Symmetry: D2
Subunit: 294 residues, 4 copies
């Protein structure tokens, strides 16, 4: 049966985490590491195990770790964590939690970066801008086997909430037209895409940042996406994200696959001649889900 | 993974065939829906191997524009002759796959936009208006449907799920959370009497998918009835935890509705912190952002 | 300008003194509030010339911590012996200015957290539960109060306003919008029969502020009653615009409640776009721009 | 009463607006102008006039400009606007609207910038791909009236920067405040102050807001950078103390300004671990705020 419980929106902010250094750079991005003067993460934790059943069927709380205590667990482990990535932090929390509570058979963690951008001061080492734009993500699932060994069964890293608009050099023509079609063909649209991008490594260890040369930074994925979007006379969103995926896998052969969840929020044209003027479209949004592997 | 589609397709229909002839339960006065106003928010996703080249080559020759999917959904609400969201989804899914023979799989999510009745004084009395309705942001019915086209051009449903989403319930007393693990990570006090606040999403699956459509309404399980089972069971129960509560809600649901196979709960704990203990009244406030949650299925095996 | 304070101070009280003894109107079955559960979201703003140096010198000696204001509000809900949000604000405002003599002005907004009854089966029958309530995200009552301390240490109310916020009403037929200006900027078709959708905020003021408190409940205007007037008038009326509609709602309010001085409307149009005209019909959500109207109905408009 | 109506969430995007150039720089900010390859604004329009009364009282739509038409007016006017600022775009719309509809006595415009940031492409800044930002954005406010002699006058103008979220990890205190029966807040000599800032300013001379003489225009980007520089430089004693100092620096850098208004909120984290860097967490819902005007 499905049987899990836990805690969501566990925010944790750490100052002066160990800097991320020695990353492999790529052409699309100036990214070369993270100072980690300020490091914030939003964590959601889910745990299960068959011995949790009576907490549901009988109201027996004997084996119930309070979700409040899980919040505490996560917050204190951020204080003790000696690594450099959100992926590595999740692995630290998972391993530690399962070693602590032996009746838990499965733990699933999601981590979302709270991004902070640098600011100018007469670049500050003290003042940061809390950003509401794109942010790194990490996902980890770990199990306790019947021989009491622990194994990672899933790991995925990501970039969420990237909103890109290309003002020209985009088309969407040639699609099916029939009784339900009113969309006109457009040989030059200002394509607006909302991108979530997730990748899996060939070797799960590479995500931890232990050998930083192998670590794929979300910042680098961001810049690949904007470069490829720029370079490409897009034929659809589908066309674009395939090519973004291919470029990612070329740049990072230590990656096994890249997953995209994209949305289309392209503006409606109001004045064609006239520069041009556009407006926000109605609520319905197009979306695409696609994996490139490898 | 290869899918594409359209979200936030809103469609509002006036004078849909009413839902009546349902079977009642003790926990609920629900007797049907007059459907003067019927509103749904639909998400559609489609797949098929023949869509590959739309990604790999930028060839749109087999692409149904998602804008067309929108039009398809909205136009089908106009010709829908059925009485439920679940049935509406089945109607759209079947029509869509019949229309687009190169599409192999479709997935539909429908969320009710709920409307509540209002009062008017007309012709000398105060009574429920047949014209003016209040749009509600509280709990709402949901439906989910996945259908495939087989090689012989027949269509099959491969998953169906109905639901009640967004139910926010607070019980002011008669709840405890004691006896949980207290170790070096614990700062939560034991509480023999708390005002438990739960956010509930309840999802059910039928033993026979046909019962979901409302064609034989006596087998249809209405989200409004599930709502009322949830509020009745909460009231009846000296709860020992949210875990304990949702098990008892699922048991009552499956006892009342033998046509159902299982019930799934996604619940969140948003219980208030106490500020003033004495003082029969008390004062509480909103807690901080972290929220507890539970994910649990009650099945046939849990029934005696 | 110089004010500071605290927002989103939530406070939930059980078994507040019930509101009863209100006067009824034909449009509403409202008979009072049992107040098993009473919830409010409060915002407090304070001002005073003596706060200046907290800004200009970083001197905090006359600063009431905004955290302490939160405690103040939450604690006073515990001691409040009244029956309305309006009276709760007056109690908080009066106590606060009495406590902090260097504060010259205080502004308070209270927003009801509304809860609805649910059914339970117990002791053999199905009936309204006295324990389980549904938190509502729909329309909610509001209150506003400004008070000052005068030189002789007396207190005066300088503005009071009550309201109903977030009422979303759709009337499926019996609405028109025709005869408006049609020029080089006009692409809206005339429509003799539209399903008008209005988002309503309605705010009223009393001729005597004391009537707002609930102390003499027969003079109190409940937001629930205003709600039912709005739905009733919307129903009764072959509307010619939202402008037309809200004028007639205001007229009915002022006619039913002669203790009210004026009623203010902030309305928004969210009327759906028609997709199918002949089948019942089908509509969908419009694009993001929304029309709005801001209008006060007053005594002179009566009757 | 009060009698207005209008349209909100009128979004309008323009490509290749005339670029803003020739701006006076300041120490705190690298800002030198705007390419305007992509310009977006969210407009709200409100209009009034005594002759609109019967549209309310009688259901007479004869003098009603449909709010839908107002939307069209704004979008069309962005197509023909030859200027370089949101402030200037609001004056263009206001003047043109009043000149068109003589029975309208007052118009109020709010413009909010939809900010777009530059992106990388291969190895330089893209002239085609921009990132839509949910962070801080420029604002403008304009009120214009027709007088009884049929002259038009601007009665209020205000520029702004909204939505700026700054956190300073150390070098902030909050001590010495009133302690009584209602105080539980401990004194803190070193907190990680998190402020949410809205900053609004008014010019001595309204025409300076339009950008016609760029050297006199005050850009929201410049205000942003002053705010972060001052926050950096200052061992703050309160949010009140900080925003006064930010205000003072703005008025010294920009003597063409008459005033600066602040609406700030305090969202500082709770400390969980003091001794390990430190660890903090998100506070509960209540938020402190401050409202203050600094004048010249
Ligand atoms: C505009 N548009 C649709 O309507 N559908 C689609 C699609 O599937 N892919 C696109 O890139 N654009 C688009
Ligand atoms: C308060 N609280 C927690 O912290 N965890 C849990 C839990 O798992 N179940 C509860 O009912 N309450 C609760
Ligand atoms: C549809 N519509 C507009 O565009 N403007 C207006 C208005 O001012 N009042 C309305 O009732 N409707 C409407
Ligand atoms: C923490 N804190 C309060 O509680 N009030 C105030 C205030 O007015 N100003 C601050 O800078 N901080 C603060």
């Amino acid at each position: 049966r499905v049987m899990y419980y836990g805690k969501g929106d566990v925010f944790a902010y750490r100052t002066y985490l160990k800097p991320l250094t020695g990353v492999r750079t790529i052409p699309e991005s100036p990214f070369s590491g993270r100072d980690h003067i300020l490091f914030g993460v939003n964590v959601k934790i889910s745990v299960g195990g068959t011995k949790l059943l009576t907490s549901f069927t009988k109201g027996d709380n004997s084996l119930v770790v309070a979700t409040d205590s899980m919040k505490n667990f996560i917050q204190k482990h951020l204080a003790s964590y000696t690594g450099t990535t959100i992926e590595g932090f999740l692995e630290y929390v998972a391993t530690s939690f399962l070693k602590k509570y032996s009746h838990i058979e499965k733990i699933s963690l999601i981590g979302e970066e709270i991004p902070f951008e640098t600011t100018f001061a007469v670049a500050s080492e003290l003042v940061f801008k809390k950003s509401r734009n794109e942010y790194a993500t990490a996902y980890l699932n770990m199990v306790r086997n019947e021989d009491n060994t622990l194994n990672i069964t899933e790991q995925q890293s990501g970039l969420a909430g990237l909103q890109l608009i290309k003002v020209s050099g985009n088309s969407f023509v040639g699609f099916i037209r029939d009784e339900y079609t009113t969309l006109p063909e457009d040989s030059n649209r200002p394509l607006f895409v909302y991108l979530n991008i997730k990748w899996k490594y060939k070797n799960t260890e590479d995500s931890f940042g232990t050998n930083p040369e192998n670590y794929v930074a979300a910042e680098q994925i961001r810049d690949i996406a904007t470069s490829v979007f720029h370079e490409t006379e897009t034929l659809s969103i589908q066309h674009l994200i395939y090519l973004i995926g291919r470029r990612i896998l070329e740049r990072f052969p230590q990656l096994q696959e890249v997953y995209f969840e994209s949305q289309n929020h392209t503006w409606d044209k109001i004045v064609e001649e006239i520069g041009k003027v556009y407006t926000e479209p109605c609520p319905p949004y197009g979306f695409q889900c696609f994996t490139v592997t490898q």
